Amino acid sequence: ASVSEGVLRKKYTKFFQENIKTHLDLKQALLKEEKPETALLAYSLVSPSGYRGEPLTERKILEVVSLLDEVKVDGDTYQQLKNTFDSISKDPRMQVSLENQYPGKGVGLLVATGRELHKASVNGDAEAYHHQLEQISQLPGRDQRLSMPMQQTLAIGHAMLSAEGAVGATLGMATGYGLNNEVQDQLKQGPMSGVLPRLEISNVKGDFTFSMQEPAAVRALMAYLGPKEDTSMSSPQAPKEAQEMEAARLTLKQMLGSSPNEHLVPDVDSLLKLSDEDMPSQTESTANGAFKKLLSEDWDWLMPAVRAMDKGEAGKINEKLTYKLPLDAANGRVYLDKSPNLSDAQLDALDKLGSPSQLRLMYLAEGWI
Amino acid sequence: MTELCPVYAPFFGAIGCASAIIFTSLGAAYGTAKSGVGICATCVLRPDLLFKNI
Fold first, then answer.
1. B45, closest residue in chain A (CA to CA)
2. Which neighbouring-strand residues pair with A208?
3. Å from A332 to nearest chain B CA?
4. Can you name the residues that pair with A289 across neighbouring β-strands?
5. Using CB atoms within 10 A as the burial measure, which of A55, A83, A358, B7 is most buried?
6. φ, ψ of residue A229 in degrees (nearest 5)
7. What else is known (chain B)?
8. What angle do CA A225, A1, A68 make, to 5 degrees?
9. Does B47 touch chain A if contact means CB atoms closer than 8 Å?
10. DSSP H helices in chain A
11. After which residues is chain B broken (C to N over 2.5 A)?
């Protein structure tokens, strides 16, 4: 109802037939019709980074992200995303989020193997947590333009880190490469992520440009959309620079599904505790322990529990999820059942959350709650 | 040593002392295993007959 991609490289193959290797003199070749003002909008994805600081300026995936930037039918939903990005790119608060995920821009064989079997299992769980999360935003009431490609990027990024865990554990066990490029070529097959705008950054440290199909720029965008608004920056008392970067911030936080009351501060650190005043308020702390139970009790229970909660029917969770599996016993097949044993205390806490925001479920899939 | 008491003489005593506990342990293990499978198949329906069937 909100997203429909394709993989037809033969419908518009004239843009990829000749050896076009120049960012300049490509807008005339990208017109190709009697439409001019809307063919420049698909060129706006690569145009601020089309000259400054890039190698060879036309990599073979930079055209398919610009060809399949389908603005031909609809020119409203992508323009709203383009009016919001580069309006979000003004405060240092987005920029300090784009510096935490980055740098500056014998018995010892049993230990080093276990450090990389832990890496292959954490990233194998977290990749599965985004596959059952791209079918929660398939349910009615959600949206798919911002929710789908944001978490399709992360599921590709966890599939590569999980592959590097046990390829490294194999080459260390069989000793005490070309396999990482074979799996990198394999995960680009099949579908591909929807096009989001470019998120250029210009400041006193230079003029930077990130990609938003990188798993580290996605991971810093959702950390920006976390915290609630304050008493400042949205009142008309301060018309200075705030209302064009705060209403652009809240129109993405609502676009996931998070109301401006919802706080959602991250957790990962090297410290013991986080703080005192930004703590979850024991109604969602009881509820976050119920969602973690649904992630780690079955591979298929998070989607029909959110579906049962959008209808306001979050008290029938113990009965709508029960199903029966067989068991060979000493008396025969018995057909016992598996139910999520949600207690009444955390079944009540799922009621006071009206619907889980998509931003809350994506912090949960990254281990930030 | 002696013709009545040769040197290979404790071999038969050690083999007998081993074989006693070996074959009685095999018999006890078969009895325990078969009867325990019978108890665990029975006492799903009658758990009150569990300590009677031991």
1. A331
2. A201
3. 9
4. none
5. A358
6. -70, 155
7. Present with 8450 molecules/cell in log phase SD medium.
8. 80
9. no
10. 27-31, 39-43, 64-67, 77-84, 92-97, 107-131, 147-173, 178-186, 215-224, 243-256, 284-295, 303-310, 317-320, 344-352, 358-364
11. none
